[PDB]
Design an enzyme around this catalytic site. Structure first.
Site, PDB file in Angstrom:
ATOM      1  N   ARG C  66     -51.358 -12.329  14.250  1.00 52.97           N
ATOM      2  CA  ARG C  66     -52.782 -12.580  14.443  1.00 52.97           C
ATOM      3  C   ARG C  66     -53.044 -13.536  15.600  1.00 52.97           C
ATOM      4  NH1 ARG C  66     -53.527 -11.742   8.934  1.00 52.97           N
ATOM      5  NH2 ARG C  66     -53.092 -13.979   8.728  1.00 52.97           N
ATOM      6  N   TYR C  70     -56.022 -13.126  18.517  1.00 48.17           N
ATOM      7  CA  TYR C  70     -57.024 -14.106  18.920  1.00 48.17           C
ATOM      8  C   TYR C  70     -56.928 -14.410  20.409  1.00 48.17           C
ATOM      9  CZ  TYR C  70     -57.293 -14.817  13.871  1.00 48.17           C
ATOM     10  OH  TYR C  70     -57.428 -14.638  12.513  1.00 48.17           O
ATOM     11  N   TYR C  92     -69.561 -14.008  12.876  1.00 46.15           N
ATOM     12  CA  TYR C  92     -70.279 -14.080  11.613  1.00 46.15           C
ATOM     13  C   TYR C  92     -70.150 -15.476  11.015  1.00 46.15           C
ATOM     14  CZ  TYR C  92     -66.003 -13.743   8.716  1.00 46.15           C
ATOM     15  OH  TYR C  92     -64.792 -13.976   8.101  1.00 46.15           O
ATOM     16  N   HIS C  94     -70.649 -19.351  10.702  1.00 49.65           N
ATOM     17  CA  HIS C  94     -70.640 -20.442  11.673  1.00 49.65           C
ATOM     18  C   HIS C  94     -69.453 -20.254  12.603  1.00 49.65           C
ATOM     19  CE1 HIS C  94     -70.057 -24.291  13.535  1.00 49.65           C
ATOM     20  NE2 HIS C  94     -70.913 -24.949  12.778  1.00 49.65           N
ATOM     21  N   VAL C  97     -66.275 -22.664  12.199  1.00 49.07           N
ATOM     22  CA  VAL C  97     -65.839 -23.001  10.846  1.00 49.07           C
ATOM     23  C   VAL C  97     -64.751 -22.012  10.451  1.00 49.07           C
ATOM     24  CG1 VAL C  97     -66.479 -23.027   8.422  1.00 49.07           C
ATOM     25  CG2 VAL C  97     -67.921 -24.171  10.100  1.00 49.07           C
ATOM     26  N   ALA C 124     -69.889 -19.602   5.152  1.00 47.97           N
ATOM     27  CA  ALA C 124     -69.691 -19.188   3.768  1.00 47.97           C
ATOM     28  C   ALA C 124     -69.738 -20.380   2.827  1.00 47.97           C
ATOM     29  CB  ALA C 124     -68.363 -18.445   3.624  1.00 47.97           C
ATOM     30  N   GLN C 166     -59.405 -18.362   2.798  1.00 46.83           N
ATOM     31  CA  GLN C 166     -58.443 -17.296   3.085  1.00 46.83           C
ATOM     32  C   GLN C 166     -57.399 -17.194   1.978  1.00 46.83           C
ATOM     33  OE1 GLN C 166     -58.916 -17.271   7.874  1.00 46.83           O
ATOM     34  NE2 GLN C 166     -56.982 -18.123   7.116  1.00 46.83           N
TER      35      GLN C 166
HETATM   36  N1  LIG Z   1     -68.647 -13.498   2.552  1.00 50.49           N
HETATM   37  C1  LIG Z   1     -67.837 -14.519   2.303  1.00 50.49           C
HETATM   38  N2  LIG Z   1     -67.909 -15.175   1.095  1.00 50.49           N
HETATM   39  C2  LIG Z   1     -67.081 -16.232   0.823  1.00 50.49           C
HETATM   40  N3  LIG Z   1     -66.166 -16.644   1.760  1.00 50.49           N
HETATM   41  C3  LIG Z   1     -66.084 -16.011   2.951  1.00 50.49           C
HETATM   42  C4  LIG Z   1     -66.914 -14.938   3.248  1.00 50.49           C
HETATM   43  N4  LIG Z   1     -66.624 -14.498   4.488  1.00 50.49           N
HETATM   44  C5  LIG Z   1     -65.618 -15.264   4.983  1.00 50.49           C
HETATM   45  N5  LIG Z   1     -65.303 -16.222   4.043  1.00 50.49           N
HETATM   46  C6  LIG Z   1     -64.255 -17.237   4.129  1.00 50.49           C
HETATM   47  O1  LIG Z   1     -63.863 -17.416   5.477  1.00 50.49           O
HETATM   48  C7  LIG Z   1     -62.558 -16.901   5.642  1.00 50.49           C
HETATM   49  C8  LIG Z   1     -62.469 -16.174   6.974  1.00 50.49           C
HETATM   50  S1  LIG Z   1     -62.550 -17.370   8.322  1.00 50.49           S
HETATM   51  C9  LIG Z   1     -64.219 -17.086   8.944  1.00 50.49           C
HETATM   52  C10 LIG Z   1     -65.245 -18.058   8.350  1.00 50.49           C
HETATM   53  C11 LIG Z   1     -66.647 -17.937   8.953  1.00 50.49           C
HETATM   54  N6  LIG Z   1     -66.621 -18.409  10.327  1.00 50.49           N
HETATM   55  C12 LIG Z   1     -67.671 -18.693   8.115  1.00 50.49           C
HETATM   56  O2  LIG Z   1     -68.602 -19.280   8.664  1.00 50.49           O
HETATM   57  O3  LIG Z   1     -67.596 -18.733   6.885  1.00 50.49           O
HETATM   58  C13 LIG Z   1     -62.310 -15.980   4.462  1.00 50.49           C
HETATM   59  O4  LIG Z   1     -60.941 -15.855   4.165  1.00 50.49           O
HETATM   60  C14 LIG Z   1     -63.048 -16.718   3.379  1.00 50.49           C
HETATM   61  O5  LIG Z   1     -62.279 -17.806   2.925  1.00 50.49           O
END
Ligand SMILES: Nc1ncnc2c1ncn2[C@@H]1O[C@H](CSCC[C@H](N)C(=O)O)[C@@H](O)[C@H]1O
Ligand SMILES: Nc1ncnc2c1ncn2[C@@H]1O[C@H](CSCC[C@H](N)C(=O)O)[C@@H](O)[C@H]1O
Lengths: 55, 262, 262, 51
Positions: C66, C70, C92, C94, C97, C124, C166
């Site tokens: 991965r 990236y 998607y 933030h 984050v 999230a 994750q």
């Molecule tokens: N719909 C969702 N509901 C809960 N956690 C989520 C999610 N989508 C992403 N995540 C979390 O983010 C991780 C991917 S990293 C990306 C995070 C994203 N930038 C954010 O702002 O949340 C996933 O493994 C999970 O832990």
């Protein structure tokens, strides 16, 4: 003042215009010299003049 | 009636979400708590039926527990809901991040049989990651309210990015004053010295509220904190003191070692 | 050229900030990483010049780190910036984050002399507080990436709300697979048992991506985690195991006790 | 059709509150089929992306 700031905060066109030339954009929207000076020195107190505490 | 609590973000006008703005626009009545008068003007143009929750804070040197302030805010919100109004609470930032009024209002509304929900917003923490170029995932993230960290037993992980919220009132146990004292902050520094050296660099962060305003990102040794100029909107960031070290116990259970990590 | 990284939130269309939507609208080109095809259609109507960063993930069973994915995303973003384009990256939630692409792109852009910035979004984590009615300030908050929690030395505070991000790839050390195995999750459970009992209730949370969709809030004892159905969008919440206890040493230095707390 | 309605609903708090009162009535009025409505009421996101 309040009109300009509300537009600037919402409008990514204007925001990128402002970052290119802050003084020119501010003058073009009618800000006074003291208002512009307040912005360039970061004096928010004077700007509010010119216009949660715990969890 | 019903209740939706939204956040407006930290920056003027533009940091509120599209849906959250629509909720404000279409509301019967709005109860606001915004950072300044520019934000308040913007809200009133969106919807002129605003009741400012600021009025319930202690006025004119008067001694008032902040928990009595919040109760009156919550009760004022519920009165509009009970009357039958499609009610919105518009709080700055994220309405459920270090903020009790909306959680209490939703709990109370739900218990009295009213539809209530919370819409997430962009909080000061979310602003910090972006402003400082820090990802909370890099080495982990811990948040505590500063006074709770002092009053109760919390153990920080010194490899993470640590946030102490409401640092300006750290140790102000009566919840009647707008700020703490320098001797209180010195006790915090000594407490923090269990994990962080006295010359450890910390950051006083303040996200900007206006689009012409730069954020406050003030770096200083931990020892100098009691002399610093702190404001109610200030958050204290304490970067890691220590780099991530390998967890050989678990790596062995996983049957791998360090140079196997991808 | 220049670079702005924004977030779109978790929910379709409505959870992006007003300013961030405007950045997408006016961009020369957009590089996207969105949860689904409904979100992708919405973006393409906003601005038809979209390059989907999804293309750089491993396709068709291929072994691919991965970290190379990236890097290719970051390089593609920077190529548009170097060419002279006013470039936006729309991720998607933030964008900074638990996401490296935007931080790396901004770091690289700044070093080559280009204007680069990050606009905060609704993550999230922000959705979780709202969906579960939890304030991170109530008893504090800790976030770690699940695999880092296993591979390196992190000590959680069991009085806080603990998040492991994750979780679906917890212990997948190669970063070439989309999911871990139940034996890895069982090792996590045993590791976590240092602080949390086996019958400790945890929550598998998934914020909704569509407005007709309820969030996933699945409660189960920690022991049952290895058998649970996990997805890439799953986050594991671990509520406090212990109540907050009084910090007598500091309260005495503050000259007060429990009964004096406001 | 479907994708239009969802973008519609996610942004518009009036429609959102209209939908909350009466999901089936709002969905039928915006042209969703019975299989699409069934996918929504059972929470089958797999099938919604198919349709
Ligand atoms: N719909 C969702 N509901 C809960 N956690 C989520 C999610 N989508 C992403 N995540 C979390 O983010 C991780 C991917 S990293 C990306 C995070 C994203 N930038 C954010 O702002 O949340 C996933 O493994 C999970 O832990
Ligand atoms: N502009 C700002 N910059 C940095 N931190 C801020 C801030 N405004 C509020 N805070 C933090 O939040 C505390 C008040 S609690 C309210 C937080 C708000 N709901 C949010 O979403 O951020 C302050 O003491 C400070 O720690």
């Amino acid at each position: 003042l309040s009109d300009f700031f509300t537009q600037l905060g919402q409008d990514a066109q204007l925001m990128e215009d402002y970052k290119q030339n802050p003084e020119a954009v501010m003058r073009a929207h009618g800000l006074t010299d003291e208002q512009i000076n307040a912005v360039m020195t970061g004096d928010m107190e004077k700007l509010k003049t010119l216009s949660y505490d715990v969890i | 009636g019903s209740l939706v609590c939204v956040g407006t973000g930290l920056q003027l006008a533009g940091q509120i979400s599209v849906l959250s703005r629509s909720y404000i626009e279409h509301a019967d009545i709005v109860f606001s708590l915004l950072p300044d008068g520019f934000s308040q003007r913007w809200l009133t143009k969106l919807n002129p039926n605003v009741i400012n929750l600021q009025q319930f804070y202690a006025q004119n040197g008067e001694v008032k527990n902040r928990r009595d302030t919040y109760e009156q805010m919550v009760n004022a919100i519920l009165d509009a809901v009970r009357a039958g109004k499609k009610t919105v609470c518009a709080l700055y930032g994220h309405p459920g991040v270090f903020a009790c009024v909306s959680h209490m209002a939703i709990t109370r509304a739900k218990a009295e049989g009213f539809s209530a929900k919370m819409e997430p917003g962009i909080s000061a923490e979310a602003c910090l990651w972006a402003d400082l170029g820090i990802d909370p995932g890099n080495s982990g993230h811990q948040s505590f309210e500063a006074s709770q960290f002092m009053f109760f037993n919390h153990v920080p992980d010194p490899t993470t990015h640590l946030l102490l919220w409401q640092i300006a009132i750290a140790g102000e146990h009566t919840l009647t004053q707008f700020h703490t004292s320098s001797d209180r902050l010195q006790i915090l520094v000594e407490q923090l010295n269990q994990w962080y050296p006295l010359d450890h660099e910390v950051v006083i962060y303040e996200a900007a509220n206006l689009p012409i305003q730069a954020p406050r990102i003030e770096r200083l040794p931990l020892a100098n904190l009691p002399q610093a100029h702190l404001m109610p909107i200030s958050t204290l960031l304490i970067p890691p003191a220590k780099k991530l070290e390998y967890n050989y116990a678990i790596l062995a259970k996983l049957g791998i070692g360090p140079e196997d990590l991808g």
